[PDB]
PDB file of C-alpha atoms and ligand atoms in Angstrom:
ATOM      1  CA  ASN L   3     -17.611  16.676 -10.825  1.00 49.65           C
ATOM      2  CA  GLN L   4     -19.853  17.982  -8.427  1.00 53.10           C
ATOM      3  CA  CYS L   5     -20.212  15.944  -4.869  1.00 51.81           C
ATOM      4  CA  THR L   6     -19.257  16.236  -0.926  1.00 49.58           C
ATOM      5  CA  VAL L   7     -17.406  13.197   0.628  1.00 50.46           C
ATOM      6  CA  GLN L   8     -18.285  13.453   4.420  1.00 51.57           C
ATOM      7  CA  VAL L   9     -16.102  11.662   7.316  1.00 48.73           C
ATOM      8  CA  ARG L  10     -15.862  11.177  11.139  1.00 49.02           C
ATOM      9  CA  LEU L  11     -12.813  11.719  13.417  1.00 50.04           C
ATOM     10  CA  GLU L  12     -13.518  11.167  17.347  1.00 52.01           C
ATOM     11  CA  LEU L  13     -10.908  13.507  19.373  1.00 51.42           C
ATOM     12  CA  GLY L  14     -10.818  12.656  22.970  1.00 51.13           C
ATOM     13  CA  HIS L  15      -9.040  12.114  26.412  1.00 55.23           C
ATOM     14  CA  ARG L  16      -8.545  10.229  29.004  1.00 56.83           C
ATOM     15  CA  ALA L  17      -6.863  11.120  33.177  1.00 53.25           C
ATOM     16  CA  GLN L  18      -6.677  10.260  36.036  1.00 50.00           C
ATOM     17  CA  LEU L  19      -4.709  10.814  39.608  1.00 50.09           C
ATOM     18  CA  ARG L  20      -1.550   9.717  38.935  1.00 47.72           C
ATOM     19  CA  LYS L  21      -0.448   6.759  41.957  1.00 47.48           C
ATOM     20  CA  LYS L  22       3.074   8.016  43.182  1.00 45.92           C
ATOM     21  CA  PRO L  23       5.057   9.649  45.857  1.00 46.20           C
ATOM     22  CA  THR L  24       3.898  12.750  47.464  1.00 46.19           C
ATOM     23  CA  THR L  25       7.319  14.402  46.366  1.00 46.26           C
ATOM     24  CA  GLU L  26       6.524  14.007  42.393  1.00 45.30           C
ATOM     25  CA  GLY L  27       4.634  17.105  40.991  1.00 48.77           C
ATOM     26  CA  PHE L  28       2.818  15.538  38.886  1.00 50.51           C
ATOM     27  CA  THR L  29      -1.079  14.468  39.770  1.00 47.73           C
ATOM     28  CA  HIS L  30      -2.250  13.182  36.989  1.00 49.91           C
ATOM     29  CA  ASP L  31      -1.460  10.806  34.321  1.00 49.26           C
ATOM     30  CA  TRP L  32      -3.749  11.631  30.559  1.00 45.29           C
ATOM     31  CA  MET L  33      -3.917  10.711  27.430  1.00 43.04           C
ATOM     32  CA  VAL L  34      -5.475  12.170  24.341  1.00 43.37           C
ATOM     33  CA  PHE L  35      -5.656  10.962  20.619  1.00 42.94           C
ATOM     34  CA  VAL L  36      -7.720  11.436  17.208  1.00 46.54           C
ATOM     35  CA  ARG L  37      -8.536   7.853  15.974  1.00 44.53           C
ATOM     36  CA  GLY L  38     -11.623   7.138  13.210  1.00 45.34           C
ATOM     37  CA  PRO L  39     -14.772   5.105  14.188  1.00 43.28           C
ATOM     38  CA  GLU L  40     -15.125   1.232  14.614  1.00 44.70           C
ATOM     39  CA  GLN L  41     -13.628  -0.553  10.963  1.00 44.07           C
ATOM     40  CA  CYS L  42     -13.132   2.724   9.412  1.00 47.06           C
ATOM     41  CA  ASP L  43      -9.280   3.800   8.604  1.00 46.03           C
ATOM     42  CA  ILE L  44      -8.289   7.730   8.937  1.00 42.14           C
ATOM     43  CA  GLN L  45      -5.098   6.465   7.986  1.00 40.79           C
ATOM     44  CA  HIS L  46      -5.712   6.398   4.293  1.00 42.82           C
ATOM     45  CA  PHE L  47      -6.421  10.528   4.485  1.00 41.67           C
ATOM     46  CA  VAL L  48      -4.276  11.519   6.999  1.00 41.66           C
ATOM     47  CA  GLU L  49      -0.693  12.529   6.597  1.00 42.92           C
ATOM     48  CA  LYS L  50      -0.072  13.239  10.726  1.00 43.65           C
ATOM     49  CA  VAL L  51      -1.619  14.363  13.704  1.00 40.61           C
ATOM     50  CA  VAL L  52       0.696  17.440  15.742  1.00 39.18           C
ATOM     51  CA  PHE L  53      -0.642  17.510  19.020  1.00 40.91           C
ATOM     52  CA  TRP L  54       0.455  21.300  20.259  1.00 42.81           C
ATOM     53  CA  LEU L  55       0.648  20.395  24.204  1.00 42.90           C
ATOM     54  CA  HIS L  56       1.165  23.039  27.148  1.00 42.36           C
ATOM     55  CA  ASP L  57       4.754  25.312  26.697  1.00 44.23           C
ATOM     56  CA  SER L  58       5.747  24.187  29.974  1.00 45.29           C
ATOM     57  CA  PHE L  59       6.275  20.297  28.365  1.00 43.75           C
ATOM     58  CA  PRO L  60       9.019  18.999  26.756  1.00 40.48           C
ATOM     59  CA  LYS L  61       9.512  18.831  23.289  1.00 40.62           C
ATOM     60  CA  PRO L  62       5.999  20.002  22.990  1.00 39.66           C
ATOM     61  CA  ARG L  63       5.456  19.973  19.109  1.00 38.99           C
ATOM     62  CA  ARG L  64       4.153  16.435  19.484  1.00 39.80           C
ATOM     63  CA  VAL L  65       3.373  14.687  15.768  1.00 39.37           C
ATOM     64  CA  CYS L  66       1.775  10.946  15.357  1.00 38.28           C
ATOM     65  CA  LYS L  67       2.535  10.303  11.433  1.00 35.61           C
ATOM     66  CA  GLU L  68       0.809   7.022  12.080  1.00 33.41           C
ATOM     67  CA  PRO L  69      -2.063   5.154  14.229  1.00 32.67           C
ATOM     68  CA  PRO L  70      -2.122   5.251  16.991  1.00 32.50           C
ATOM     69  CA  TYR L  71      -2.385   9.702  17.066  1.00 31.52           C
ATOM     70  CA  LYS L  72      -2.280   9.794  20.618  1.00 32.11           C
ATOM     71  CA  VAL L  73       0.484  11.279  23.339  1.00 34.25           C
ATOM     72  CA  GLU L  74      -0.077  10.326  26.677  1.00 30.86           C
ATOM     73  CA  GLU L  75       1.898  12.417  29.594  1.00 29.83           C
ATOM     74  CA  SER L  76       1.523  13.032  33.441  1.00 29.66           C
ATOM     75  CA  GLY L  77       0.436  16.541  34.268  1.00 32.03           C
ATOM     76  CA  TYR L  78      -0.445  19.262  37.240  1.00 30.70           C
ATOM     77  CA  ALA L  79      -3.339  20.390  35.660  1.00 28.49           C
ATOM     78  CA  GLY L  80      -5.406  20.596  32.384  1.00 26.73           C
ATOM     79  CA  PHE L  81      -5.048  23.514  29.439  1.00 26.96           C
ATOM     80  CA  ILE L  82      -6.624  24.203  25.819  1.00 27.95           C
ATOM     81  CA  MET L  83      -4.568  21.907  23.182  1.00 28.11           C
ATOM     82  CA  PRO L  84      -4.365  22.868  19.759  1.00 28.24           C
ATOM     83  CA  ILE L  85      -4.543  19.713  17.410  1.00 31.35           C
ATOM     84  CA  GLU L  86      -3.912  20.200  13.807  1.00 29.55           C
ATOM     85  CA  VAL L  87      -4.662  16.483  11.706  1.00 31.91           C
ATOM     86  CA  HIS L  88      -3.225  16.745   8.187  1.00 30.40           C
ATOM     87  CA  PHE L  89      -4.764  15.337   4.922  1.00 28.07           C
ATOM     88  CA  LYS L  90      -2.967  13.649   2.080  1.00 28.41           C
ATOM     89  CA  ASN L  91      -4.718  15.780   0.791  1.00 32.23           C
ATOM     90  CA  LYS L  92      -2.983  18.068  -2.987  1.00 31.44           C
ATOM     91  CA  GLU L  93      -5.119  21.041  -2.706  1.00 32.98           C
ATOM     92  CA  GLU L  94      -7.755  22.827   0.006  1.00 30.40           C
ATOM     93  CA  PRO L  95      -8.064  22.134   2.697  1.00 29.74           C
ATOM     94  CA  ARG L  96      -4.506  20.542   3.389  1.00 29.69           C
ATOM     95  CA  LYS L  97      -5.605  20.139   7.243  1.00 31.14           C
ATOM     96  CA  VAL L  98      -8.229  21.429   9.973  1.00 30.65           C
ATOM     97  CA  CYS L  99      -7.106  22.626  13.654  1.00 31.43           C
ATOM     98  CA  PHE L 100      -9.470  21.647  16.776  1.00 31.57           C
ATOM     99  CA  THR L 101      -8.955  23.335  20.247  1.00 31.73           C
ATOM    100  CA  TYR L 102      -9.384  20.775  22.454  1.00 30.44           C
ATOM    101  CA  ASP L 103     -10.318  21.280  26.419  1.00 30.36           C
ATOM    102  CA  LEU L 104      -7.526  19.216  28.136  1.00 29.16           C
ATOM    103  CA  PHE L 105      -9.050  18.932  31.007  1.00 28.48           C
ATOM    104  CA  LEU L 106      -8.313  16.593  34.583  1.00 26.61           C
ATOM    105  CA  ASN L 107     -10.641  14.788  36.968  1.00 28.02           C
ATOM    106  CA  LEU L 108     -10.279  17.088  40.515  1.00 25.72           C
ATOM    107  CA  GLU L 109     -11.033  16.685  44.002  1.00 25.39           C
ATOM    108  CA  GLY L 110     -11.379  12.914  43.770  1.00 25.29           C
ATOM    109  CA  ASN L 111     -13.862  13.072  41.108  1.00 25.67           C
ATOM    110  CA  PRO L 112     -14.351   9.261  39.019  1.00 25.57           C
ATOM    111  CA  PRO L 113     -11.358   9.260  35.628  1.00 23.97           C
ATOM    112  CA  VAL L 114     -12.441  10.782  32.475  1.00 22.12           C
ATOM    113  CA  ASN L 115     -13.237   9.020  29.671  1.00 25.75           C
ATOM    114  CA  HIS L 116     -14.327  12.114  26.759  1.00 23.48           C
ATOM    115  CA  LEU L 117     -15.123  11.515  22.941  1.00 23.50           C
ATOM    116  CA  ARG L 118     -15.315  14.696  21.068  1.00 23.91           C
ATOM    117  CA  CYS L 119     -16.748  13.429  17.636  1.00 24.81           C
ATOM    118  CA  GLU L 120     -16.125  15.148  14.391  1.00 25.88           C
ATOM    119  CA  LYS L 121     -18.166  15.089  11.009  1.00 26.98           C
ATOM    120  CA  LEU L 122     -15.836  16.513   7.984  1.00 26.18           C
ATOM    121  CA  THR L 123     -17.556  17.204   5.071  1.00 29.75           C
ATOM    122  CA  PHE L 124     -15.376  17.599   1.648  1.00 31.33           C
ATOM    123  CA  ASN L 125     -16.702  19.586  -0.847  1.00 32.05           C
ATOM    124  CA  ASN L 126     -15.413  18.459  -4.284  1.00 32.39           C
ATOM    125  CA  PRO L 127     -12.713  16.401  -3.603  1.00 33.69           C
ATOM    126  CA  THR L 128      -9.694  15.875  -6.140  1.00 31.55           C
ATOM    127  CA  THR L 129     -10.027  12.237  -7.515  1.00 30.21           C
ATOM    128  CA  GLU L 130      -7.105  11.066  -5.460  1.00 29.90           C
ATOM    129  CA  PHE L 131      -8.288  12.269  -2.049  1.00 30.02           C
ATOM    130  CA  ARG L 132     -11.924  11.072  -2.903  1.00 29.82           C
ATOM    131  CA  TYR L 133     -10.524   7.503  -2.928  1.00 34.71           C
ATOM    132  CA  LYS L 134      -8.493   7.682  -0.043  1.00 34.88           C
ATOM    133  CA  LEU L 135     -11.541   9.910   2.230  1.00 37.50           C
ATOM    134  CA  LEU L 136     -13.612   6.493   0.507  1.00 35.98           C
ATOM    135  CA  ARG L 137     -10.478   4.300   1.156  1.00 33.44           C
ATOM    136  CA  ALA L 138     -10.900   5.162   5.148  1.00 33.85           C
ATOM    137  CA  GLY L 139     -15.154   4.514   4.985  1.00 33.05           C
ATOM    138  CA  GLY L 140     -16.312   8.663   3.872  1.00 32.15           C
ATOM    139  CA  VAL L 141     -19.687   8.626   2.058  1.00 29.47           C
ATOM    140  CA  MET L 142     -21.427  10.497  -0.453  1.00 31.88           C
ATOM    141  CA  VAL L 143     -24.052  12.795   0.140  1.00 28.96           C
ATOM    142  CA  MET L 144     -26.807  14.356  -2.785  1.00 28.70           C
TER     143      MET L 144
HETATM  144  N1  M8K S   1      -1.738  26.223  32.400  1.00 26.18           N
HETATM  145  C1  M8K S   1      -1.523  25.173  32.389  1.00 26.18           C
HETATM  146  C2  M8K S   1      -0.796  24.168  32.797  1.00 26.18           C
HETATM  147  C3  M8K S   1       0.322  24.765  32.455  1.00 26.18           C
HETATM  148  C4  M8K S   1       1.489  23.265  32.980  1.00 26.18           C
HETATM  149  C5  M8K S   1       1.210  21.688  33.011  1.00 26.18           C
HETATM  150  C6  M8K S   1       1.711  20.623  33.046  1.00 26.18           C
HETATM  151  O1  M8K S   1       1.110  19.588  33.449  1.00 26.18           O
HETATM  152  N2  M8K S   1       3.076  20.515  32.676  1.00 26.18           N
HETATM  153  C7  M8K S   1       4.346  19.787  32.273  1.00 26.18           C
HETATM  154  C8  M8K S   1       5.633  20.038  32.299  1.00 26.18           C
HETATM  155  C9  M8K S   1       6.994  19.591  31.784  1.00 26.18           C
HETATM  156  C10 M8K S   1       6.066  17.395  32.309  1.00 26.18           C
HETATM  157  N3  M8K S   1       7.455  16.713  31.756  1.00 26.18           N
HETATM  158  C11 M8K S   1       6.033  15.275  32.183  1.00 26.18           C
HETATM  159  C12 M8K S   1       6.839  14.206  32.090  1.00 26.18           C
HETATM  160  N4  M8K S   1       6.580  13.568  30.894  1.00 26.18           N
HETATM  161  C13 M8K S   1       8.303  14.296  30.322  1.00 26.18           C
HETATM  162  C14 M8K S   1       9.302  13.492  29.458  1.00 26.18           C
HETATM  163  C15 M8K S   1       8.203  12.862  28.540  1.00 26.18           C
HETATM  164  C16 M8K S   1       7.308  11.750  29.451  1.00 26.18           C
HETATM  165  C17 M8K S   1       6.870  12.392  30.553  1.00 26.18           C
HETATM  166  N5  M8K S   1       5.082  16.007  32.193  1.00 26.18           N
HETATM  167  C18 M8K S   1       5.078  17.317  32.464  1.00 26.18           C
HETATM  168  C19 M8K S   1       3.795  18.398  32.691  1.00 26.18           C
HETATM  169  C20 M8K S   1      -0.089  21.817  32.770  1.00 26.18           C
HETATM  170  C21 M8K S   1      -1.161  23.151  32.497  1.00 26.18           C
END
């Protein structure tokens, strides 16, 4: 009737210098992901994650319909990556779009290993979607 459910997402990325021929253009390997915290299963409320890569990549609309929600790639530059997390929700909101700063380690700096923790607050979710948030390890507030 009246209640808020909070769930947690973790977006992150790893990047390092690629050990390859001088004549291979891509300097870096990187990996971007969405996950839950330890012993939460976001798959209960996440229908899919869509990573929107730079237009220069082949098939830059990358869909993960189940875990792991991640893209592994090679490249030569950082970019801003739209990341859409779609919900198993019959009403609004149906999804959330993050603007992810995919930056590389440049000038012989250590590997990048970044995490961005997002808190989602669902006000007054339906019965069915409430159960999914709770199954995923969501918590109620009051
Ligand atoms: N602003 C800006 C900006 C412009 C371009 C890039 C970039 O690295 N492009 C790019 C373009 C094409 C690429 N194929 C691969 C390798 N992959 C292709 C098939 C899947 C597995 C290997 N890595 C690629 C990287 C990044 C930032």
